[PDB]
């Protein structure tokens, strides 16, 4: 089964959307109720394990299309809503623990709620993927859910983060590097699911080696993207990314050795299988060095036993072939260095499923908007705590 590290959900303070004298009419009054109720419905779903992607999408759709009114102009989008700065929103971050952050900007709310929705997908994905009984359709759903999340993250970063007036801090969820790492991670993870399948269905070793390799690179990339953060909060996560890089590079060498073998090349085949097992042991090292490190999110232990059942066969096949040359044991002449993997995976690479927010609600009409009279203006709650497992 699959093991994916998860940082905690973002938490927020409840918003009543109650503007009092400012709201002069029934239509404007109704929207505030819709916002209040749809935001709350969405927030409670994050902690509902019985919730599925159809339900999550419908709630997000509701809230976001309403929320859009505080941001976009009615049909004139490319023109900005007068309501944007009306409300202060308060959100915590995945790596900052219970320390909240506030902006009176509807865009800050949109992006932060978006993030959580994307987070929810990767978490729906990881729970479903932790199943030992996992079926093919569940794996598609895992694979697909991770692609949704990737696309959302990407959309937030590309089309949204630039709109914020005040820049977010290093180590905060809405910052290019941090979002970029979430995007990359999601793709890596989807590919993990593809690899386990390519392995089940007995696809060509060269296919599986390239895919494993590229996946190791994604993890490297993500790790590098995060290297810019402060070790305190990024440590455990990075340890886990480094772990995953090794785990999958081993796979690359193992399956790439089978390539080299079928190529009548022995010494490098053996040197490749050796690199694999060495790497795989190095991954066991980093694995509980990761179990030590204190950081955001519960620590995760890999169930998968496969690597050795594969390597044993390869090792046994290689020795049969490469004895009377290099083997039987005490090998020569084996190349001092591991053969450098340069591999492109033509199959199994994952693209983010392109995301866009729903259009501004039909409920937002000029009259309804006019019924918010900002000339009628003259304490704070705290984030309700996410409270997961």
């Amino acid at each position: 089964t699959h093991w994916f590290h998860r940082n905690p959900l973002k938490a927020t303070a409840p918003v009543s959307f109650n503007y009092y004298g400012v709201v002069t009419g029934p239509s404007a009054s109704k929207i505030c109720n819709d916002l209040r109720s749809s935001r709350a419905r969405l927030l409670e779903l994050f902690t509902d394990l019985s919730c599925n992607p159809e339900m999550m999408k419908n709630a997000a759709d509701s809230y976001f299309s309403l929320l859009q009114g505080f941001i976009n102009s009615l049909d004139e989008s490319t023109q900005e809503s007068k309501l944007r700065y009306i409300q202060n929103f308060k959100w915590t971050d995945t790596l900052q623990g219970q320390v909240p952050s506030a902006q009176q900007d509807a865009v800050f709310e949109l992006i932060s709620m978006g993030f959580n929705v994307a987070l929810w997908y990767t978490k729906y994905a990881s729970r479903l993927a932790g199943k030992e009984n996992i079926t093919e359709d569940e794996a598609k759903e895992v694979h697909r859910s991770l692609k949704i999340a990737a696309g959302i993250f990407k959309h937030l970063k590309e089309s949204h983060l630039p709109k914020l007036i005040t820049p977010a801090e290093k180590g905060r969820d809405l910052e290019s590097r941090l979002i970029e790492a979430y995007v990359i991670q999601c793709q890596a993870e989807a590919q993990e699911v593809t690899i386990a399948r390519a392995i089940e269905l007995k696809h060509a070793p060269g296919l599986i080696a390239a895919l494993a390799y590229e996946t190791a690179n994604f993890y490297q990339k993500a790790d590098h993207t995060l290297s810019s953060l402060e070790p305190a909060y990024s440590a455990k996560w990075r340890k886990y990314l480094h772990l995953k890089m090794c785990f999958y590079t081993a796979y690359a060498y193992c399956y790439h050795g089978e390539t080299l073998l079928a190529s009548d090349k022995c010494g490098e085949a053996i040197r490749s299988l050796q690199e694999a097992e060495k790497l795989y042991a190095k991954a066991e090292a980093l694995c509980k060095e990761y179990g030590e490190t204190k950081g955001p999110g519960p620590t995760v232990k890999p169930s998968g036993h496969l690597f050795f059942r594969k390597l044993g066969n390869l090792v046994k096949n290689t020795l049969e072939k490469c004895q009377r040359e290099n083997g039987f044991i005490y090998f020569q002449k084996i190349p001092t260095e591991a053969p450098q993997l340069e591999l492109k995976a033509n199959y199994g690479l994952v693209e983010p499923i392109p995301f866009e927010f729903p259009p501004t609600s039909v409920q937002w009409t000029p009259e309804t908007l006019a019924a918010f009279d900002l000339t009628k203006r003259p304490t704070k709650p705290k984030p309700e705590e996410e409270v997961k497992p």
């Binding site: 199959y347 199994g348 690479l349």
Partner: peptide
């Protein structure tokens, strides 16, 4: 369905075999 090179591919992007 098919990928860009015209080869049959499953939902995961793997060739069909």
């Amino acid at each position: 369905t098919k990928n860009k090179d015209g080869v049959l591919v499953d939902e995961f992007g793997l060739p069909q075999i």
